[PDB]
């Protein structure tokens with residue numbers, strides 16, 4: 001009955017829904033990442049604001065693939081921007097996504113994951129449209145419910161899900177808040193980062209296992225906070241440096 005238990009039970013139920021409903025899509029996404037690695041392509045992940053947190057969770061990560069890179073749009077990487085409200089305004093700016101993609105090392109055949117719960121703003125929609133125009137394969141992590149219950153804020157009238165090769169449904173109901181209290185007018189307690197981080201790890205774990213099953217040793221990193229982790233990782237980062245853009 002207490003709020004903590006209600007929230008955690010809501011988050012568990014959402015993870016169960018992802019496990020039971022998105023198993024085949026997670027497999028397809030992990031397979032696309034493994035194909036891209038095998039074929040010599042690069043891997044990138046993007047999200048704006050709090051959707052950036054799931055993208056970051058798979059980059060330079062203990063237990064994660066060394067080959068996953070972050071596509072950084074300045075001002076929308078997490079909520080670090082001053083003022084934080086500028087992050088929200090930048091999600092509406094047409095042309096930011098193309099500036100960032102065109103400057104990046106992404107090329108035809110690469111894979112880009114785009115995390116956007118709503119999928120409705122100009123920046124993630126444009127990011128997907130322009131990435132596909134550049135020949136990238138695009139995986140979206142998005143709550144498809146928003147596409148029927150909200151209006152697109154992109155000029156095209158379309159949502160992120162309309163421009164993805166693979167769509168992973170992150171299930172969160174409109175409002176991104178799992179609890180209500182009779183005395184309290186706004187809902188509270190968002191689970192979207194819990195779910196998207198979990199979805200992202202399921203995808204990259206699938207990619208790692210798929211590489212392994214093909215006789216390809218997955219380039220996995222170890223935690224730098226267990227003795228010996230940084231030495232292990234140094235080997236891996238050097239080995240795959242050509243497709244890694246967060247170090248040299």
Ligand SMILES: O=C(O)[C@H](O)[C@@H](O)[C@H](O)[C@H](O)COP(=O)(O)O
Nearest residue numbers: 048049050051116117118119176
């Ligand atoms: O207001 C909210 O819903 C979040 O606090 C906000 O930071 C969100 O994470 C970004 O606006 C990106 O939203 P999308 O994930 O829908 O792209």
